[PDB]
Subunit: 205 residues, 3 copies
């Protein structure tokens, strides 16, 4: 068995808004993504692109509190059926017989707050970990400014009363606009690269 493994999911051209992301005001929406991870001997490197198109993201409730939200969270999961809040799709594994457990991040020993999926507050704010600064690309009148991303391996309490370790990425826009229904266009960000310890070196199924 290889001491190196890769997982890829999403659309190479950020074309299919199958991701379920949530704004800091608890409004879900849809975005495209491209996720490319490698496990090198127990260290997980995750490369993530995200794109949100106002014409394919869904309904933006009016109201100051809803339109003025600047943050949104994307969950990267290796438990694509048991615990997958953002709906990361099945992808491509290399070697093809490698277990998805090869992309589970190690338990985070700083012990951040649990994301409790049983209380149906769908927004979790990633807060404890590295903050990286990005400038995204726009089209239309949408202008988020620069976006910092907080990255935090987090225990997620599923409805089955068990905790699973996922990576929360919270995108922190400098300016309001993505969630204001009068503002239109697209914002695309990445590659957002995160490194953390994996639960294990790569294992075959």
């Amino acid at each position: 068995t290889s001491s190196v493994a890769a997982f890829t999911s999403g659309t190479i051209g950020l074309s299919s808004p199958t991701g379920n992301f949530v704004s800091s005001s608890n409004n879900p929406f849809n975005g495209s993504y491209f996720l490319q991870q490698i496990n090198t001997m127990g260290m997980l490197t995750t490369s993530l692109y995200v794109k949100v198109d106002t014409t394919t993201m869904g309904t933006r409730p009016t109201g100051a509190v809803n339109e003025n939200a600047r943050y949104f969270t994307v969950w990267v999961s290796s438990f694509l059926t048991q615990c997958n809040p953002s709906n990361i799709g099945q992808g491509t594994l290399e070697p093809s017989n490698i277990s998805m457990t090869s992309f589970e991040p190690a338990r985070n020993p700083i012990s951040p707050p649990v994301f409790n999926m049983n209380q149906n507050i769908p927004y979790y704010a990633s807060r404890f970990g590295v903050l990286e600064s990005y400038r995204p690309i726009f089209t239309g009148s949408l202008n988020t400014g620069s976006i910092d991303v907080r990255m935090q391996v987090t225990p997620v309490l599923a409805t089955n009363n068990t905790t699973y370790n996922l990576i929360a990425f919270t995108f922190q826009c400098a300016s309001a606009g993505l969630f204001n229904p009068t503002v239109n266009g697209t914002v695309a960000i990445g590659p957002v690269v995160h490194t953390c310890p994996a639960a294990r070196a790569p294992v075959t199924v």
Copy 2:
């Protein structure tokens, strides 16, 4: 065959100014570098050191526009003959029969503006991607302050009119001086480390 490969170019001495770098005022200059790259199963990691010695970098013209310039760009290329704006030198491949195409970055899906080499405008500002913060080391009276580095995989229209994907690094100084002919010394920065998706896993020639 190997799922991991390495490319090394430049000199550890940082005293061979063969790099063709360009200030935001469109003034070319000579600088030293040391580039060490690894491809791990389709993920490209780049370590770059840059060093500029005012006595070897070439004539610095006077005038506010030239002397007050704080930004400069270095292009990292895997197409050393066909599209190599900053003159990355032939280097060492491990294993020795691995193809340079193993160090090609994957097309950036956020689609940033193309660098058109045919326009005879040598400076391109890296804008879209991660910004990392460095403190460099100086000698002499030269003092750039801290330097942030923006890192962007970019399509480049080469002089043969094929489009190639390269990595733009724009170094953003806090203080002017590097391009002031009355300010002398050296500045050395690094290791500046970038991760992005490669176009492929490693392949032999």
Copy 3:
């Protein structure tokens, strides 16, 4: 022999305060750490967690001259018996016959100031290289605010008069409190990830 190798030291529990760290007021103290490193074909990646508990860190002398320190340094070393200022413990190598010399960082060609362990000032400030921003987790009255980490490969003159290359991590707290003996609690930070070139590709003993 593998072109990939791993080293792990410390405890995931972050409750064994055997690390010897030093504040900016030259006061030593004890902390817990969990260090996981990988060498991929000559590229060294370091994941580091640090935790400090006021009940186990040791005596914090009184007086603003001591209590107002916001910075501390942690030395990551591969020379565990000859040059190991923070007392990184023997750990676990994968594969088990791989040399510790596989985790030695390459000499830093920007040539930052040497740390001479034979003289009597224990605090060394990491200055030259990347600065990364983290938010840590607290318990108790302790609040350091956010913490930036400066990461610098550094020549260290050991007490045997040989110079070794090590990695200096200086943790820069936004607020004082950690070294004020009337403030109690814990602070845990990470994963702090650093990449730099290794002195060599992995080699077996």
